[PDB]
Amino acid sequence: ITTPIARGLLRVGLTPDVVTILGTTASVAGALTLFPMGKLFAGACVVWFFVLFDMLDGAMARERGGGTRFGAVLDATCDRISDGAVFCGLLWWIAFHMRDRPLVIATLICLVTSQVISYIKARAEASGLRGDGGFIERPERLIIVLTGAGVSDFPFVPWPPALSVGMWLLAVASVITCVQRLHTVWTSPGAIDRMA
Amino acid sequence: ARITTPIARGLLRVGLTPDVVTILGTTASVAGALTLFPMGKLFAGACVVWFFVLFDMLDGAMARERGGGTRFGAVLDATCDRISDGAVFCGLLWWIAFHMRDRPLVIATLICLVTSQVISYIKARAEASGLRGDGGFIERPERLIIVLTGAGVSDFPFVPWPPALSVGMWLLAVASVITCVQRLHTVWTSPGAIDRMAI
Ligand SMILES: [Mg+2]
Ligand SMILES: [Mg+2]
Ligand SMILES: [Mg+2]
Ligand SMILES: [Mg+2]
């Protein structure tokens, strides 16, 4: 399915980089429009939709002979922007409509740790070390927070506490992941040799 | 230097390592930001954060006195910068959201919080692929100068000017968004950036 769509996009002169940006813009607009209004199930559906959309830029890149280093950096940077918009959008609902200050704390931990978890991996690789793995990578992050948000606002059978359950589980697991990833850095070949 | 070096040798002699000092200074800076800023003690908070900016010269001085920095230590020091920056903006966010109840300034603060992480990420992620992703208007020194001067002046002893917090945050938000674009352009122009490769 993605292959004929990708080819059709290449055919009209779109590039993987433009499609990356367009999908990210749409996801961000969706998260920042729907979550602050309390439309958490709709917001989660829109975010998941653009997760699916995100299969197209990689498919486009493979078809035309390969991805680029800029494309990889752009794609990963857009992932951070997207994650940020999800948590900021939810934060707005939680802070100003639910007025739930403990949940704001969990949400802010999730927001910062999402960025920090990804940063450890990139910064480690920039030094020739490893810094991947751990409990929470981007797929687990999105499954947890979007399922919490979606269930909390689910049609006909909503369970509002689901939003808090997801955010607190994610916050704890994300802090642990930071420590795990730093431990992976520390054990990498060459990580602790002094360089004058 | 004539001051950090003797201090750094002292901490090594006591048995502290650069990495432990990195973690301790960052914990203290986070504790200060998350205690003082949410209480509205913005001048005292800015002073504490500034003190630990000075303190972060010590772990690098220690590493050099030991015979060299380490790659782990470089990753750790950079990662703790993201954590510290995160704590500054979260602490200020708390005061702005729940005590000033100033919703447009919350938007600026969230933009600063996210862009502080994204700006740094572009550089690290570019280097991970062998490209360059530094430069632009807002790096960590400019970021701290703007937000901590805005916070401190808004709560300055004797002659406070409360709008300084908003001025600083909006200027930082705008300049930070621009910096994200600048840095990605720097990635794009790096040698080899657009050669195709198997994924
Ligand atoms: Mg994709
Ligand atoms: Mg991606
Ligand atoms: Mg340092
Ligand atoms: Mg540091």
Curated annotation (Swiss-Prot), chain A:
It catalyses: a CDP-1,2-diacyl-sn-glycerol + 1D-myo-inositol 3-phosphate = a 1,2-diacyl-sn-glycero-3-phospho-(1D-myo-inositol-3-phosphate) + CMP + H(+); 1,2-di-(9Z-octadecenoyl)-sn-glycero-3-cytidine-5'-diphosphate + 1D-myo-inositol 3-phosphate = 1,2-di-(9Z-octadecenoyl)-sn-glycero-3-phospho-(1D-myo-inositol-3-phosphate) + CMP + H(+). It is a multi-pass membrane protein. The keyword Metal-binding applies. InterPro entries: CDP-OH_P_trans, CDP-OH_PTrfase_TM_dom, CDP_ALCOHOL_P_TRANSF_CS, PIP_synthase_PgsA1. It is an enzyme of class 2 (transferase). Homodimer. The chain crosses the membrane at residues 16-34, 40-63, 69-96, 101-126, 138-152, 162-186. It comes from the Bacteria. Changing residue 119 to E: Almost loss of catalytic activity. One of its GO terms (biological process) is phospholipid biosynthetic process. The lineage of its organism: Bacteria, Bacillati, Actinomycetota, Actinomycetes, Mycobacteriales. This is Phosphatidylinositol phosphate synthase. Its EC number is 2.7.8.-. GO terms for molecular function: CDP-diacylglycerol-inositol 3-phosphatidyltransferase activity; magnesium ion binding. Pathway: Phospholipid metabolism; phosphatidylinositol phosphate biosynthesis. Changing residue 123 to Q: 2-fold decrease in catalytic activity. It is found in: Cell membrane. The active site is at residue 79. A CDP-1,2-diacyl-sn-glycerol binds at residues 17-20, 58, 62, 68. Catalyzes the conjugation of the 1'-hydroxyl group of D-myo-inositol-3-phosphate (also named L-myo-inositol-1-phosphate) with a lipid tail of cytidine diphosphate diacylglycerol (CDP-DAG), forming phosphatidylinositol phosphate (PIP) and CMP. PIP is a precursor of phosphatidylinositol (PI) which is an essential lipid for mycobacteria required for formation of their cell wall. The keyword Lipid metabolism applies. M.tuberculosis PgsA1 has been identified as a promising candidate for drug development because of its vital role in growth and proliferation of the pathogen as well as the differences between eukaryotic and mycobacterial PI biosynthesis pathways. Changing residue 80 to K: Large decrease in catalytic activity.
From Swiss-Prot, chain B:
The chain crosses the membrane at residues 18-36, 42-65, 71-98, 103-128, 140-154, 164-188. Pfam families: CDP-OH_P_transf. Mg(2+) 2 binds at residues 56, 77, 81. A CDP-1,2-diacyl-sn-glycerol binds at residues 19-22, 60, 64, 70. It is a multi-pass membrane protein. It is found in: Cell membrane. Mg(2+) 1 binds at residues 56, 59, 77. It comes from the Bacteria. Gene3D superfamilies: 1.20.120.1760. Keywords: Cell membrane, Lipid biosynthesis, Lipid metabolism, Magnesium, Membrane, Metal-binding, Phospholipid biosynthesis, Phospholipid metabolism, Transferase, Transmembrane, Transmembrane helix. Its main location: membrane. It catalyses: a CDP-1,2-diacyl-sn-glycerol + 1D-myo-inositol 3-phosphate = a 1,2-diacyl-sn-glycero-3-phospho-(1D-myo-inositol-3-phosphate) + CMP + H(+); 1,2-di-(9Z-octadecenoyl)-sn-glycero-3-cytidine-5'-diphosphate + 1D-myo-inositol 3-phosphate = 1,2-di-(9Z-octadecenoyl)-sn-glycero-3-phospho-(1D-myo-inositol-3-phosphate) + CMP + H(+). M.tuberculosis PgsA1 has been identified as a promising candidate for drug development because of its vital role in growth and proliferation of the pathogen as well as the differences between eukaryotic and mycobacterial PI biosynthesis pathways. Catalyzes the conjugation of the 1'-hydroxyl group of D-myo-inositol-3-phosphate (also named L-myo-inositol-1-phosphate) with a lipid tail of cytidine diphosphate diacylglycerol (CDP-DAG), forming phosphatidylinositol phosphate (PIP) and CMP. PIP is a precursor of phosphatidylinositol (PI) which is an essential lipid for mycobacteria required for formation of their cell wall. This is Phosphatidylinositol phosphate synthase. It comes from Mycobacterium tuberculosis (strain ATCC 25618 / H37Rv). The gene is pgsA1.
